[PDB]
Structure 1
Amino acid sequence: EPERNIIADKYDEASVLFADIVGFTERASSTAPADLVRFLDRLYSAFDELVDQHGLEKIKVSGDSYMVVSGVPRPRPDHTQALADFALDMTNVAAQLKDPRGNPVPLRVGLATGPVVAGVVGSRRFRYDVWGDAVNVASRMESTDSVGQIQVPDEVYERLKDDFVLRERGHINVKGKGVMRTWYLIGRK
């Protein structure tokens, strides 16, 4: 049954992360849906542990993705930095796990900051959900990410540049809109 909206509110500013493990479908890998589910549950349980250790908020999403949010529902003035630190731990932890073949986990991570909408949605049962501008951006940062990096837009770079190390990935000129630039979040300063 499709979910429906119940209540929502706009938040001026929050930070949103998406992560996934790309190419772990039965189609792509031939691994049985049950073995996939077990290996993913391990990886996602590791991320669950990091979310709790960091005091952040996991948003139950449908689909392959893992979603984490900072400064929504409850604001914190370091929301971007806190999600960056969590993102770094998430990719550094995943880098110590391997698939069953002993190959690196093909993790993608995108991270964005900006307005969002949050509230309650549900079908039979309900859950807290977050969507809108920064979620859209985070989603695109994750789905065009190079595997093993953390991709972020300019807005995140402006907010983090003094305290983390970032390297520019590239830019594209879109006439007549403007320039689209993204960065890799590499580490802490």
Structure 2
Amino acid sequence: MMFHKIYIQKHDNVSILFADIEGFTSLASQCTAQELVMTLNELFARFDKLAAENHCLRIKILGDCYYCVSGLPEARADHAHCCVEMGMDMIEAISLVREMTGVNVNMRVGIHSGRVHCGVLGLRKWQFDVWSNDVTLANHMEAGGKAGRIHITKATLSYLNGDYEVEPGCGGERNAYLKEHSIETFLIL
């Protein structure tokens, strides 16, 4: 009665994946406006196909930014492997769509595992989304990430059971948010 009904809820033990186009604006110089939307849609329709295979739920597309989650609607203990495996297919999938652009397109992955709140805001035109400090971080992992590589957090590796071979990511020296929070990052090989 007082507030509106919040269609949100907490979820623990989840993994948030973010990925953006490296040099989209540089690319947006060559092709026509409609040619981009072709490639973009060609890419993400492919991305949305990969999602379901890796037990991943796509959240929202912000132009050249794609970001999905793993650990919804019901939970999974295997949640962090998924995002990584998703990123893996996401990486190669971009190289095969690079065939169609004929130009140097690249993805930049960032994964963090933590807690979210999720649902929908407002009243009109709902879209599924996720929110938390952890979600805020995930985006800065992407941002302070490496080209064609999968940037993961200290927390993401602890759920990752040490199955993949990593290396010092040094996100602190790439993003200001990652430094100012002493976050130690890694990179999948």
**Range into which the TM-score falls when normalised by the shorter chain:** 0.7 to 0.9
- How many residue pairs match? The answer is 182
**Aligned residue for 1:156?**
156
Tell me how large the CA RMSD over aligned residues is: 2.7
Aligned residue for 2:64? 64
Tell me which protein shows more helix as a share of its residues.
2
| Structure 1 residues 17 and 5: alpha-carbon distance in aligned structure 2, compared to 1, 3 A threshold | farther
Task: Point out the structure with the larger strand share.
Answer: 1
Report the TM-score when normalising by structure 1.
Answer: 0.83
Greater mean deviation of Cα atoms: 110-119 or 31-40: 31-40
Q: Does the residue aligned with 1:166 lie in a helix, a strand or coil?
A: coil
Return the offset for 1:6.
4.0
Seq. identity, %: 32
Q: Equivalent of 1:182, from 175, 182, 185?
A: 185
Q: 2:20 touches 2:66 (CA, 8 Å); kept in 1? A: yes
> Gaps (5+ residues) in structure 2?
none
AA at the equivalent of 2:165: V
Q: Which residue is 2:31 aligned to?
A: 31
Amino acid at match of 1:184: L
**Structure-2 change in CA distance of 1:134 and 1:178 (3 Å):** closer
For the 8 Å contact 2:23–2:105, the answer to whether it is kept is no
Decide which moves more: 126-135 or 73-82.
126-135
Amino acid at match of 1:106: N
Give a deviation string over 1:149-186, Cα, whole Å, max 9, x none: 11111111232252111111226499xx7633211122
Do 1:24 and 1:36's aligned partners in 2 also have CA atoms closer than 8 Å? no
- One-letter amino acid of the counterpart of residue 185, structure 2: T
Letter in 1 for 2:186: W
Using the TM superposition, give the Cα deviation of residue 38 of structure 1 relative to its aligned residue in structure 2, in angstroms: 0.7
- Structure 2 length as normaliser, TM-score? 0.83
Show structure 1 runs of 5+ residues with no match.
none
Cα deviation per residue 1:106-127 (whole Å; 9 max; x = unaligned)? 2111111001110122553212
> Per the alignment, do residues 10 and 41 of structure 1 end up closer, same or farther by CA in structure 2, a change over 3 Å counting?
same
